[PDB]
Amino acid sequence: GTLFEVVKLGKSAMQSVVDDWIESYKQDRDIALLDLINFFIQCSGCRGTVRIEMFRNMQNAEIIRKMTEEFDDYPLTMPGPQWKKFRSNFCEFIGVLIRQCQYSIIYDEYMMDTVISLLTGLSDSQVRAFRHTSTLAAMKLMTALVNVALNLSIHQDNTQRQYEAERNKMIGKRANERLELLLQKRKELQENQDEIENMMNSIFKGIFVHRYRDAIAEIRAICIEEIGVWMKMYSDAFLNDSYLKYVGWTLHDRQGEVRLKCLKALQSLYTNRELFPKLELFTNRFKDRIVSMTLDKEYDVAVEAIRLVTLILHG
Numbered sequence: 208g209t210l211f212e213v214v215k216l217g218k219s220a221m222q223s224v225v226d227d228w229i230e231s232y233k234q235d236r237d238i239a240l241l242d243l244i245n246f247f248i249q250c251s252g253c254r255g256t257v258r259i260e261m262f263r264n265m266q267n268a269e270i271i272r273k274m275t276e277e278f279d280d281y282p283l284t285m286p287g288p289q290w291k292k293f294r295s296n297f298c299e300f301i302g303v304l305i306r307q308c309q310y311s312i313i314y315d316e317y318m319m320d321t322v323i324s325l326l327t328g329l330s331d332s333q334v335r336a337f338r339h340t341s342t343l344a345a346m347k348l349m350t351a352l353v354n355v356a357l358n359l360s361i362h363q364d365n366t367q368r369q370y371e372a373e374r375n376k377m378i379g380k381r382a383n384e385r386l387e388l389l390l391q392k393r394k395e396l397q398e399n400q401d402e403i404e405n406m407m408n409s410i411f412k413g414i415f416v417h418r419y420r421d422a423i424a425e426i427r428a429i430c431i432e433e434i435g436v437w438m439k440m441y442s443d444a445f446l447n448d449s450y451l452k453y454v455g456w457t458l459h460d461r462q463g464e465v466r467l468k469c470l471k472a473l474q475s476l477y478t479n480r481e482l483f484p485k486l487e488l489f490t491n492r493f494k495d496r497i498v499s500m501t502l503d504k505e506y507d508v509a510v511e512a513i514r515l516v517t518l519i520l521h522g
């Protein structure tokens with residue numbers, strides 16, 4: 208509306224285009240997801256675009272096979288001022304998209320299934336551009352879902368404290384309407400969390416477990432950096448010896464870039480004197496590798512290995 212109104216209300220270009228996308232999704236899921244599919248294609252620097260007939264009739268396999276041929280150096284590698292902010296923008300887009308869809312659309316069983324299947328399929332592509340773009344997207348997607356799970360948790364606690372106060376207040380008395388709504392609230396929220404845990408599994412088992420050992424070092428780095436993020440954000444779910452084995456296995460990586468990320472991830476965990484108990488078995492299992500990297504060969508890896516070891520020491 209007015210200039211005062213538009214300024215006080217600092218919706219970015221990205222927040223605006225996600226509000227519009229949601230409005231379009233509510234008119235026609237199909238055209239909205241086609242646009243979202245084309246976005247991920249254009250983001251890879253692919254010069255083709257999916258039409259509504261392909262979307263409705265073709266499997267992701269066929270779509271990706273047909274877009275594989277329409278390939279001429281992709282946005283995420285470009286140097287130049289006009290692509291400086293692209294990576295940062297791409298990542299922000301995905302958090303804004305999902306933050307905004309987090310209360311309804313995400314739980315419709317069509318939007319997230321479409322995106323994740325497309326990302327999974329692109330992550331199995333021979334084309335570097337496709338693997339790099341889809342994995343980075345899926346890794347930020349996962350983090351966006353973890354933030355949703357954290358928001359659900361808060362509500363799940365307030366629903367549980369309210370359900371208690373009302374269950375106590377009754378006792379001997381017939382279960383009234385307030386108690387039935389809260390007992391129905393509490394099921395819905397836990398059913399929401401199951402669905403989040405589900406999308407996180409599809410992304411983890413479909414993309415992460417394959418991409419973290421990718422041929423391309425930047426893709427390996429992207430995976431390691433992000434599992435470190437899930438392990439700090441949501442400790443009860445991701446900070447365990449099955450997920451940690453991925454980080455430890457990758458300490459042995461051939462590239463500084465990737466060894467560096469493994470150490471930055473473990474640094475963020477070991478600083479918190481609280482999940483320090485949950486790293487005991489991990490510390491016994493990989494103390495030898497960690498301690499060896501203090502003299503790594505790449506200066507900056509050594510500096511980080513040394514910083515990690517002093518963290519472990521002080522705990």
Ligand SMILES: Oc1ccc(CN2CCc3ccccc3C2)cc1
Binds near residue numbers: 444
């Ligand atoms: O994001 C989360 C991931 C896992 C859990 C739940 N735990 C226990 C349930 C379960 C069942 C079978 C195998 C593994 C698991 C995982 C909670 C949150």
